[PDB]
Point group: D2
Chain length 254, copies 4
Amino acid sequence: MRVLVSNDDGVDAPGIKILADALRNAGHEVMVVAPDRDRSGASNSLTLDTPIRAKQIDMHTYSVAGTPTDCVHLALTGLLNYDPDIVVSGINNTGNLGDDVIYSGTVSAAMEGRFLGLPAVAVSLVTLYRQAPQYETAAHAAINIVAQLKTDPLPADTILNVNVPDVTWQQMRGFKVTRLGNRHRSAPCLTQTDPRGHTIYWIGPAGPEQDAGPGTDFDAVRNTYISITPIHVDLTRYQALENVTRWTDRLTAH
Amino acid sequence: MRVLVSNDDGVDAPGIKILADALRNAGHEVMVVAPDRDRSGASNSLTLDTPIRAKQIDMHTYSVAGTPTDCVHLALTGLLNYDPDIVVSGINNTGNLGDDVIYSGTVSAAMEGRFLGLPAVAVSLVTLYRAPQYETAAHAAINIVAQLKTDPLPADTILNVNVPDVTWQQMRGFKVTRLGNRHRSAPCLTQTDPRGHTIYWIGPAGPEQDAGPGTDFDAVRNTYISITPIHVDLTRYQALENVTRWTDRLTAHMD
Amino acid sequence: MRVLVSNDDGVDAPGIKILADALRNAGHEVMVVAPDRDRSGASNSLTLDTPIRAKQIDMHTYSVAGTPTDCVHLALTGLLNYDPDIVVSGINNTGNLGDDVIYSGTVSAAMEGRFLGLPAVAVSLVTLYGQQAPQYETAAHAAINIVAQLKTDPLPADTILNVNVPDVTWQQMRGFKVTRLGNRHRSAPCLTQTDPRGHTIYWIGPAGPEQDAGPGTDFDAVRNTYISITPIHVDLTRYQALENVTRWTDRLTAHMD
Amino acid sequence: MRVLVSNDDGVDAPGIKILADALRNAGHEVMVVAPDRDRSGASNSLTLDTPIRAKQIDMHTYSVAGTPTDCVHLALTGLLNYDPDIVVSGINNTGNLGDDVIYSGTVSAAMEGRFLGLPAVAVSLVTLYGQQAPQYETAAHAAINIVAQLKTDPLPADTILNVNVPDVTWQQMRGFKVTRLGNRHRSAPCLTQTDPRGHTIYWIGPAGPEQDAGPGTDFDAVRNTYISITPIHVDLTRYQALENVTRWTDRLTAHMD
Ligand SMILES: [Mn+2]
Ligand SMILES: [Mn+2]
Ligand SMILES: [Mn+2]
Ligand SMILES: [Mn+2]
């Protein structure tokens, strides 16, 4: 199938190169439209106030001086004579798990892909802070997910957030559908003093009160499972609408 | 009630000052923990790799050199001897509507407020530019906060509020909305910068935009305060049982 | 005279409002062209890859979504129907001293002023942080005093003044002092600490005693409550090195291994 | 000799890998301490408000989540058990010429090298954008040739070399040329265009004919297929201006208005 591949680590990131190579090996057409530089931990929103510069790097590769969402958006709205069936974003050089996902650049690209009407998959390698990162494994996971989606499509308002354990494929215990975890809640605040004497604050390490037990994406990748979290792209809480609608009439009554 | 107020325009933004002032006028205790500078269009994720510096500005105000989520997170996890019942983020100097909301700094602050277990409300003034009625959004805010004291939100839910940049009298009312979508329509414009390079504008949202009745766009366009209850948990639970079968295959045969 | 005022702390910075007002109260005409937000930790170079938006806040104030150099550049190249005699950048909320000067946003605006052929002054408040209030008026007083002088005593070729003002009242100020740039970087060791996770992080330590902050330097001046004025290059070309480098450069033209 | 290699395009940049390898193939020991990501449009100043993470990619390569100056600083102040004789920063994917030099990330790393007492060279490839491939080998060849010379001919006090390499094969290269910094900023007008919405935006225009890119300048050299070597100040202090500024500064000790 026609795959549009982006990332947020940059168009020259080893992750996206290996992902694209893998996807072509599987028989897929792969256009790559990805940031000129690493924009991990940068804002993810579509650039609207300035024009975006996009140079071509090869016949299948574009380097966009903009966000990952800019990339996919440009890629799907005129930058290419290319109608991809799917958007694959990755492979991220770090995992994107739990409440980090909402602000993940890698995920943002996939979200834009779904915003513009395409099945999208975010792929992140859960590299541990410790040797070379097993991008081949995530790429392996990717080409397998893409294949299954060709014959079995995702629901509407849904992308797949995929996290792959930084191990060989043989060492992978398998695929595991998960919900998003939560490490923010537990993470306390640490008051310390920098060398210049200023008071600084560390977001503390996530305590035991973390939502990282069974069923979470954390728990999966921790136990060497490829985590597949189907996530919203529409943030609207429809379940709370009629309840807020009834709440708002009470609000406006007063 | 005890209100924690943040924003993403900065601690000195007129929006947040007016919001805090209003909320105190309503009788609420208001701690303000907000970015040192404008971080609109900056990354929203919790800072973890570096420590955050937070100076106190007054007895109720903290200037945090970090993200809006850093602000609320620090504010709720040790920076304050203060247990707020609610987190109000705003007032944003621009509206946060449709598919912009996911990446809104103002919304991010409210998200963290709910992540840490508090009812949260994002407040944005829908300003079109060529003075901005912050007082109106602040009035909308203090009214929303009041109703939440006696009528609480569901779990995994914050309120994304957008207020038309008009006087309160000119406001047609409150309207619960779903998130719109302007991205889909927005095409790509190829143009040439003065130095000759090929540049690309994200085109203006065409008629194919999801901004009709029921959307937050349509509400604020027609001078209604838009209240969109949004997810905090992005997990698509309705797709869990669906994509599991899809996955079982893969987790069975491996190669 | 006509003054173009900028900074890097933002058009809303108290340092620039106070500077501009002081300069107006002194009888100068003052256009303020300054960043929309604080860019004290941003790149200083001219924005070329993208266009720059300039919002006019009032008659004599422009908010520019770009670098301090962008501000001055735009202001001097057609944004304004205005012909300034001098560029004054500041007042920076923090000091800009020694080997920090070269990467200062404040100084960058002054740099661009000189690049475009204008006398320029960077004004920074050496704040040490602690309440009260930042003595921007003091720095402003210094600024209008310095600007008065450049009206009569022109700066030499490719020179701007880097001015640092001790964060004190004007009455406490011992005076003005012409200074050279100090050096604190070499004396700043690398401190190897560990984050909460246990992972090793590296702080750049505070400047030790081996720093170049003795007599004649800007550091020494401002620490002794003296307004420091450092005339600084805008032309980085080490001209006195040209002849020397030329000598072994000529040999390299014989392209070998 | 022992070379500390950095850049601003990132530790994964082809320009720095090729530079480092060339320098090793020349028999130098080479530690690479370079940003984790491309920071070509980032601030250059030392990170002081936060700690810096350094990841060791291999024996002679460190990935640093901080500025180019952070890299060199850390590398020279305790990150490494390594005592380099020279700092070489590059190879930048784009040229760093004239009035742009002062804000160059590449140059910034070299700056910090000199600040910490080391001979330093900034190496940039004057790429003009055309497919093929960026001639980093050419620049690398230039680098190892220049580094060989500084082993024997030491640079003067507070001087680094700003080296720009024409994006050509080594055989096309006409030679090396000692140059002064050119000036394109003054010749770069402000172009007032309008975005799709109709709102007015301001481009900084391309450098017109009034630019300082004539003979003797770095621009002229690289445009004529010459490797440009500009010795540049690391000490921005305009020493030749000290006496002059001192003359009207002493007056200002009359502080009452
Ligand atoms: Mn990434
Ligand atoms: Mn904002
Ligand atoms: Mn500043
Ligand atoms: Mn660069």
